[PDB]
Design an enzyme around this catalytic site. Structure first.
Site, mmCIF file in Angstrom:
data_model
loop_
_atom_site.group_PDB
_atom_site.id
_atom_site.type_symbol
_atom_site.label_atom_id
_atom_site.label_comp_id
_atom_site.label_asym_id
_atom_site.label_seq_id
_atom_site.Cartn_x
_atom_site.Cartn_y
_atom_site.Cartn_z
ATOM 1 C CG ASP A 117 -2.185 0.953 1.009
ATOM 2 O OD1 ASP A 117 -2.367 1.516 -0.098
ATOM 3 O OD2 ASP A 117 -2.780 1.278 2.023
ATOM 4 C CG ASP B 149 0.205 0.345 6.169
ATOM 5 O OD1 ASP B 149 -0.906 0.878 6.058
ATOM 6 O OD2 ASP B 149 0.488 -0.733 5.627
ATOM 7 N NE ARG C 299 -3.951 5.077 0.458
ATOM 8 C CZ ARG C 299 -3.855 5.009 -0.861
ATOM 9 N NH1 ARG C 299 -3.917 6.108 -1.591
ATOM 10 N NH2 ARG C 299 -3.666 3.845 -1.459
HETATM 11 C C1 LIG Z 1 -1.792 14.101 12.107
HETATM 12 N N1 LIG Z 1 -0.675 13.200 12.336
HETATM 13 C C2 LIG Z 1 -0.828 11.878 12.283
HETATM 14 O O1 LIG Z 1 -1.897 11.374 11.948
HETATM 15 C C3 LIG Z 1 0.337 11.019 12.686
HETATM 16 C C4 LIG Z 1 1.592 11.466 13.078
HETATM 17 N N2 LIG Z 1 2.605 10.644 13.376
HETATM 18 C C5 LIG Z 1 2.397 9.311 13.326
HETATM 19 N N3 LIG Z 1 3.404 8.506 13.682
HETATM 20 C C6 LIG Z 1 1.151 8.770 12.979
HETATM 21 O O2 LIG Z 1 0.981 7.410 13.143
HETATM 22 C C7 LIG Z 1 0.073 6.701 12.316
HETATM 23 C C8 LIG Z 1 0.836 6.152 11.112
HETATM 24 N N4 LIG Z 1 1.433 4.928 11.634
HETATM 25 C C9 LIG Z 1 2.421 4.292 10.982
HETATM 26 O O3 LIG Z 1 2.862 4.718 9.929
HETATM 27 C C10 LIG Z 1 2.956 3.031 11.635
HETATM 28 C C11 LIG Z 1 3.953 2.245 10.814
HETATM 29 C C12 LIG Z 1 3.530 1.230 9.970
HETATM 30 C C13 LIG Z 1 4.430 0.542 9.175
HETATM 31 C C14 LIG Z 1 5.780 0.865 9.223
HETATM 32 O O4 LIG Z 1 6.736 0.188 8.443
HETATM 33 C C15 LIG Z 1 6.631 0.230 7.104
HETATM 34 F F1 LIG Z 1 7.688 -0.308 6.571
HETATM 35 F F2 LIG Z 1 5.624 -0.453 6.655
HETATM 36 F F3 LIG Z 1 6.529 1.410 6.567
HETATM 37 C C16 LIG Z 1 6.223 1.846 10.088
HETATM 38 C C17 LIG Z 1 5.310 2.529 10.879
HETATM 39 C C18 LIG Z 1 0.802 4.475 12.873
HETATM 40 C C19 LIG Z 1 -0.364 5.426 13.125
HETATM 41 F F4 LIG Z 1 -1.560 4.913 12.690
HETATM 42 F F5 LIG Z 1 -0.519 5.691 14.453
HETATM 43 C C20 LIG Z 1 0.125 9.643 12.650
#
Ligand SMILES: CNC(=O)c1cnc(N)c(O[C@H]2CN(C(=O)Cc3ccc(OC(F)(F)F)cc3)CC2(F)F)c1
Ligand SMILES: O=c1[nH]cnc2scc(-c3ccccc3)c12
Length: 279
Positions: free
Chosen positions: A139, A157, A143
């Site tokens: 994905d 993600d 976004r």
């Molecule tokens: C307004 N600001 C926001 O919304 C906001 C701000 N800062 C954040 N950190 C956030 O977190 C959201 C996004 N998230 C992930 O991206 C988690 C993630 C997933 C796969 C991965 O590895 C990869 F290789 F796949 F990329 C690595 C991290 C978790 C969440 F849902 F909490 C939202």
């Protein structure tokens, strides 16, 4: 591998950043996490379901997130499994998702050519790291990229609600998918390269929807018939040539992400003299 456990009372919920069918995402302060930082901002993903099957998938995800360690991958700090809801703690990316950031810094001040190339190079760097581990994102889209302090861009993600227009029904992000993924549900390093080509197009259109003039069904026809997104106005011919290299119909003919990254990094250090107004 070895998942860090954070005490519930070390997390202080401050605001709700978003929500989906999975649960909620909060802005929080986390205590006793990083040295010299008695209090620090974090993003907390809270899971609504506390069933033994949800708990097992959560553990699997937490272990995978612990393993991924890179400058352009959103940092994971650990879990809180002190009853319901199960919590995942991440660094807080103060400028939110890249799609919203591109649209808020678009001509509608505007990000310059050099800034657009640095964004693209940083997304490519994170993908080089994932391809090296044989990890397939499935994905990849702006976004799912996030912007932190100093225009640092990282891949994440959200798994949420504001972007259900980007998925078509299992929900598939069809506009970012190559023909082999739409037709056969085959997801590989090669389909991630195609999605990166679409990410490049989103960057250079300041976050516009690929095939925005078309419904999901019409976009599938364009993709499976070999139709190509046109060169954005802000996009120099040298960057468009990189996008076209990502969009080869045959997966085996697309460029490797390491090569795409090396070309983008070279242009980010020495931007071509290109003025969007002159086309
Ligand atoms: C307004 N600001 C926001 O919304 C906001 C701000 N800062 C954040 N950190 C956030 O977190 C959201 C996004 N998230 C992930 O991206 C988690 C993630 C997933 C796969 C991965 O590895 C990869 F290789 F796949 F990329 C690595 C991290 C978790 C969440 F849902 F909490 C939202
Ligand atoms: O997130 C919000 N949005 C709109 N109003 C309000 S009042 C309180 C919140 C809140 C505060 C802490 C955690 C979770 C939510 C909030």
């Amino acid at each position: 591998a070895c998942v860090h456990h954070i005490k519930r009372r070390d997390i202080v919920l401050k605001w709700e950043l978003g929500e989906g069918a999975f649960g909620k995402v909060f802005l929080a302060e986390c205590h006793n996490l990083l040295p010299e930082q008695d209090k620090m901002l974090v993003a907390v993903k809270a899971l609504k379901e506390a069933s033994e099957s949800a708990r097992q998938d959560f553990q699997r995800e937490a272990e995978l997130l612990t393993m991924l360690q890179h400058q352009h991958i959103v940092r994971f700090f650990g879990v809180c499994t002190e009853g319901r809801p199960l919590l995942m703690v991440f660094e807080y990316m103060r400028h939110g998702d890249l799609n919203r950031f591109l649209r808020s810094h678009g001509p509608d001040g505007p990000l310059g050519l050099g800034q657009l190339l640095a964004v693209a190079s940083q997304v490519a760097a994170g993908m080089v790291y994932l391809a090296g581990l044989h990890f397939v994102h499935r994905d990849l889209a702006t976004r799912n990229c996030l912007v932190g302090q100093g225009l640092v861009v990282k891949i994440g993600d959200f798994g949420r609600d504001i972007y259900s227009t980007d998925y078509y029904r299992t929900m598939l992000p069809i506009r970012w998918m190559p023909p082999e993924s739409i037709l056969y549900r085959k997801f590989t390093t090669e389909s991630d390269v195609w999605s990166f080509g679409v990410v490049l197009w989103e960057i250079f259109t300041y976050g516009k929807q690929p095939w925005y003039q078309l419904s999901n069904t019409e976009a599938i026809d364009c993709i499976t018939q070999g139709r190509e997104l046109e060169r954005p106005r802000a996009c120099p011919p040298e960057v468009y040539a990189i996008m076209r290299g990502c969009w080869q119909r045959e997966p085996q003919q697309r460029h490797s992400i390491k090569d795409v990254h090396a070309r983008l990094q070279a242009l980010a250090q020495a931007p071509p003299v290109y003025l969007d107004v002159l086309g």
